[PDB]
A = this chain, B = another copy of it.
Amino acid sequence: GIFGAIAGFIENGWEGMVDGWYGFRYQNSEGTGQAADLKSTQTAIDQINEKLNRVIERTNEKFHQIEKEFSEVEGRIQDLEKYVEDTKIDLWSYNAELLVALENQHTIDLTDAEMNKLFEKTRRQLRENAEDMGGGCFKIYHKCDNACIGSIRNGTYDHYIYRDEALNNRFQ
C-alpha cells in the first residue's frame, strides 16, 4: 500500500487483537500488555461503513418499461429494443466493475493511512525520549511503567519530565 505501514514496515497483523483494528503492545518492568486504539479504529470504520451510499442512490421503484424478450422475429423495431437494453446493461456493468475497484483501492489506502498516522502521532509525543526500532516499535529510553504507557495511549504523555533521563540513556 502507498504509505508502506500495513504489509510494510509493520511485518504483520495481530490475530490476538479482537477489540480494535489498531492498537499497542508494550513491555516494561511490570510485564507485557496489549490495548486497542479506539479513535483510529473508529475513523477507519466510519469511512468504510456503508461507503457505497455516498455514490449509489437509494434504490427507487421502476414500473412499466420496454419488452426485453421476444417470441417472433420482427426486424427494425425489435433490433433497436434489444440494442438499447444491451447498451444499458454494458454501461451499468462497467460502472459496477469500476466502482468496486475504486472503492476497494480507497479502503486499502485509508486503513494503511490510519496505521501510519497512529505511528506518527506516537512518534511526535515521544520527541527525543524514544527511537524508532523499525517494525513499528519504539524503544523508550526512560523508566516507563503502566501509567506512563497509559499517558502515551491517551495522548497526555509529557516528554519534558523524562527528557533529561532519556537523553542520558540514549547518548551515554
Per the 8 Å Cβ criterion, residues 120-140 of A in contact with B are 120-121, 124-125, 127-128, 131-134
Are B124 and A9 closer than 8 Å at their CB atoms?
yes
- B-chain residues with CB within 8 Å of residue A65 when the two chains form the complex: 79, 83
The count of chain A contact residues (Cβ–Cβ below 8 Å) is 53
Q: Is the CB of A134 within 8 A of B125?
A: yes
- CB-CB nearest in chain B for A95: B94
With A2-B109, A65-B79, A84-B84 known as contacts, the answer to whether A98 contacts B99 (CB < 8 A) is yes
**Closest residue on chain B to residue A167 by CB atoms:** B171
Q: Choose among B97, B101, B102 the residue that contacts A57 (Cβ–Cβ < 8 A).
A: B97
- CB-CB under 8 A from A77, the residues of chain B are 76-77, 80
